[PDB]
């Protein structure tokens, strides 16, 4: 798995590969690891697919009930609910979740929640097995307040390398763009990103 979320001028973009493996067998080659917990709060999932799906479903329930009572939750609130589940059930979970969202007040925000259940607010975040290979690349090439096209290129190139070196990662590069304008899905196929 290779996943990342990146803040930019207009908001935030989540990116992910599409490969799911059981040992060396690719159980699913068209996986969707970008999952919606609210209209403009999404997450990237890494670790146990059962655990991260179970968690995300519970969060989506909590934010739906939050919205019924108190109106739209902040991205910080969504990250907090994720953290509460991950931290309090750390002994029985294997989950590495990046939370990304768009407010109009706060704009694009990214929170990463690693194995322990700690929270870390960052300008961008990388995670999953394939992320190890692009720490160097991402640190050298990330800038703050990039345009939409620059940020798509940054994610595309980054995950292209993560896919190249990590056997656990592969397939299509899915992306989800979060801005004031709305929610845009993007997909990029092997023949496109491999030649970069």
């Amino acid at each position: 798995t290779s996943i990342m979320a990146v803040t930019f001028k207009d908001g935030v973009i989540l990116g992910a590969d599409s490969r799911t493996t059981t040992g060396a067998y690719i159980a699913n080659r068209v996986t969707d690891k970008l999952t919606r917990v609210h209209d403009k709060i999404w997450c990237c999932r890494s670790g146990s697919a059962a655990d991260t799906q179970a968690i995300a479903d519970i969060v989506q329930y909590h934010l739906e009930l939050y919205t019924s009572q108190y109106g739209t939750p902040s991205t910080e609130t969504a990250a907090s609910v994720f953290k509460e589940l991950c931290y309090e059930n750390k002994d029985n979970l294997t989950a590495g979740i990046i939370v990304a969202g768009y407010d109009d007040k706060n704009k694009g925000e990214v929170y990463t929640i690693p194995l322990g259940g700690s929270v870390h607010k960052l300008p961008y975040a990388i995670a999953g097995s394939g992320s190890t290979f692009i720490y160097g690349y991402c640190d050298k090439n990330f800038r703050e307040n990039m345009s939409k096209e620059e940020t798509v290129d940054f994610i595309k190139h980054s995950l292209s390398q993560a896919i190249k070196w990590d056997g656990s990662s592969g397939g299509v590069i899915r992306m989800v763009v979060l801005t004031a304008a709305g929610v845009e899905r993007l997909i990029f196929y092997p023949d496109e990103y491999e030649q970069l």
């Binding site: 939050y66 009572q69 108190y70 939750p73 902040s74 910080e76 609130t77 990250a79 907090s80």
Partner: protein, 243 residues
């Protein structure tokens, strides 16, 4: 008859007489008020000096919930404390799960549902307090008032206790004369005046004024008590207006 002997029993009118009897305990209590201002709220209360032996400034009636919400009440003081203790538990669990401090409308419903639950069963007594509370959240200033039935609404000004009619009239003048709004420092002065004017209903014993406030500019959106020179300035203003 017998419909008023047990809580949660509908009379043939459709009324819960035990809740209406709790209101009588509220009406018997000292006067308390709330004023919504431009960027915050001001709370004030009448404290009856039963005797010279009461230590001045010590028997504090206004209570803070979290760091941004003030609560004041009239009626049975222990019932009010019990309600604030619950409010603090609700505000703590909200912040624990959702990180952000509890919004004031959210907090208002937490108290409301709890108070309402005490009108559902014969094994409990309704709350013998009306609670005026509020503060500053992300959406600005909010002032609420909550009754023994569990009913609450948002207010521009709020008043309860023995001198409530007097206070309400004074609050209605401020609303008419200041449509653009009232400043925090003005609201402190006006709160002092209103408690002094409302003290004609409890004129036998002398009293002690207690004021608190949350304001985005004056207190950084945190609840604080009005102390020292600012309190004395408000007492002087109030004393000048009655004479």
């Amino acid at each position: 008859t017998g419909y008023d002997l047990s809580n949660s029993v509908f009379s043939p009118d459709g009324r819960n007489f035990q809740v209406e009897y709790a209101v009588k305990a509220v009406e018997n209590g000292t006067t308390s008020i709330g004023i919504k201002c431009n960027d915050g709220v001001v709370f004030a209360v009448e404290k009856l000096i039963t005797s010279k032996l009461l230590v001045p400034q010590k028997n504090v009636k206004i209570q803070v919930v979290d760091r941004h919400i003030g609560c004041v009440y009239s009626g049975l003081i222990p019932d009010g404390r019990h309600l604030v203790n619950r409010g603090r538990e609700e505000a703590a669990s909200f912040k624990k799960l959702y990180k952000t401090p509890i919004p004031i409308p959210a907090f208002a419903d937490r108290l409301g549902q709890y108070v309402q639950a005490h009108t559902l069963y014969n094994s409990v007594r309704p709350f013998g307090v009306s609670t005026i509370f509020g503060g500053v959240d992300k959406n600005g200033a909010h002032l609420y008032m909550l009754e023994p039935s569990g009913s609450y609404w948002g207010y521009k000004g709020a008043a309860t206790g023995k001198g409530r009619q007097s206070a309400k009239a004074e609050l209605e003048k401020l609303v008419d004369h200041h449509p653009e709004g009232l400043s925090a420092r003005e609201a402190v002065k006006q709160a002092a005046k209103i408690i002094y004017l409302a003290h004609e209903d409890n004129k036998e014993k002398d009293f002690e004024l207690e004021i608190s406030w949350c304001s985005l500019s004056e207190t950084n959106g945190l609840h604080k008590f009005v102390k020292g020179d600012l309190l004395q300035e408000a007492i002087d203003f109030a004393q000048k207006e009655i004479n």
